[PDB]
């Protein structure tokens, strides 16, 4: 999350018009989602890691 | 206002903002706690919905 | 008289409903009897609004918002693409798309929904 | 059609089961005939809500009793 928005940022900072703004924050985002496992493909990632958080809070219980 | 984002701006700080999922019986606060940021105008062409949900989707993982 | 057999439909319908939640097969039982009657009262003398289309879109919408916060992209499709093709879909006596039974059919799973966001 | 009903009441239940309501196919058959008949589904509800609880506290006892 807070390398990819930093990213986003900096891309922004640097776009040269909007297109290329839109364009670099969409893959910030997109990015962002994958490794945060908040995107499609890493959706098998992000239940695992939620069925974890899970099991964490039920010890944690 | 018990932390640091105290110091955020208040331009900023009113973006930051506390979404509660539908509330379903036995759901916990982790299940529907989430950050979100609202993009509109010309910062929408950027943060598009699909980035929106992504970004959101990382605040409540 | 119709009326009467439209209620004693509902009084069984009700009934059957009590027997299977609740896993009261005899009707002789007491509190058989006691959820028989509270659903029946509450079917006949209910101060419910009519259901509203907009709330269980809205409902669903926030059950898919909330799967897609927690990352699980794939429940947030299912959930919105079952409830759209539930709101599609004809009921077994109404034949009509979007028709109050469906509606009605959408509160009652969201007024059921357990955790949508953290399900599988 | 036939085929029409069933793919509704899969997507009922499909809907239940993503919403973890723990409803069978066949109370979700029965809630959606309730409804065609003009039951209010508030009231539905709180009365399958009444019944679930009951049923809850029932086998709590029962399970404190064995």
Redesign the interface.
């Known amino acids: 999350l807070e390398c990819s928005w930093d990213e986003l940022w900096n891309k922004v900072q640097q776009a040269q018009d909007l297109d290329h703004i839109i364009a670099a924050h969409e893959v910030f985002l997109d990015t962002i989602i994958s490794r945060c496992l908040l995107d499609s493909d890493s959706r098998a990632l992000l239940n695992q890691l939620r069925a974890v958080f899970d099991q964490i809070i039920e010890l944690q219980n | 206002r018990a932390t640091n984002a105290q110091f955020d701006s208040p331009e900023i700080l009113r973006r930051l903002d506390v979404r509660l999922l539908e509330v379903s019986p036995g759901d916990t606060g982790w299940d529907v706690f989430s950050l979100d940021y609202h993009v509109d105008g010309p910062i929408a062409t950027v943060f598009t919905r699909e980035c929106m949900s992504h970004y959101l989707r990382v605040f409540n993982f | 008289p119709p009326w009467s057999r439209?209620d004693a439909?509902?009084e069984r319908?009700?009934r059957?409903?009590?027997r299977?939640?609740?896993?009261l097969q005899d009707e002789a039982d007491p509190?058989f009897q006691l959820?028989l009657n509270?659903?029946w009262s509450?079917?006949r003398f209910?101060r419910?609004?009519?259901?509203n289309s907009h709330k269980i879109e809205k409902?669903i919408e926030?059950?898919y918002?909330?799967?897609?916060?927690?990352?699980?992209?794939?429940?947030a499709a299912?959930?919105k693409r079952?409830?759209e093709?539930?709101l599609n879909?004809?009921?077994?006596?109404?034949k009509e798309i979007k028709?109050?039974?469906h509606?009605?059919?959408?509160?009652?799973?969201?007024?059921?929904?357990?955790?949508?966001?953290?399900?599988? | 059609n036939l085929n029409a009903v069933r793919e509704t009441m899969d997507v009922l239940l499909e809907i239940s089961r993503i919403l973890n309501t723990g409803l069978d196919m066949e109370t979700l058959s029965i809630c959606v005939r309730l409804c065609e008949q003009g039951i209010n589904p508030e009231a539905l509800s709180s009365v399958i809500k009444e019944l679930r609880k009951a049923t809850e506290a029932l086998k709590a006892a029962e399970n404190m009793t064995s």
Do not use: M
Not at chain 3, 48 to 51: A, S, T, Y
Not at chain 3, 65 to 75: A, G, P, R
Not at chain 3, 111 to 118: G, Q
């Open positions: 439209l439909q509902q319908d009700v059957e409903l009590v299977g939640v609740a896993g509190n959820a509270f659903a509450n079917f209910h419910f609004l009519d259901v409902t926030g059950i918002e909330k799967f897609v916060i927690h990352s699980d992209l794939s429940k299912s959930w079952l409830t093709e539930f879909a004809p009921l077994p006596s109404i028709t109050d039974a509606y009605s059919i959408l509160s009652l799973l969201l007024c059921l929904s357990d955790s949508p966001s953290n399900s599988s």
